[PDB]
């Protein structure tokens with residue numbers, strides 16, 4: 001699992017790019033479903049603030 005850090009600016013860009021649809025807008029920011037994420041890094045790759053990190 002990657003996890004989206006609080007640097008997230010809630011731009012939405014990563015949501016459509018996750019190959020497994022593991023991202024949603026959460027209550028405070030975007031959030032990753034750790035039961036689906038496969039660590040591809042694509043979300044970080046489209047993130048202007050580099051908020052998703054491998055955890």
Ligand code: SF4
Pocket residue numbers: 001002017018019020021022023032033036037038039040041042043044052
């Ligand atoms: S690392 Fe890959 S699988 Fe995990 S949330 Fe980001 S885009 Fe989706």
Ligand code: SF4
Pocket residue numbers: 004007008009010011012013014015030043046047048049050051052
């Ligand atoms: S691309 Fe980055 S800043 Fe935009 S919603 Fe996703 S994690 Fe947040």
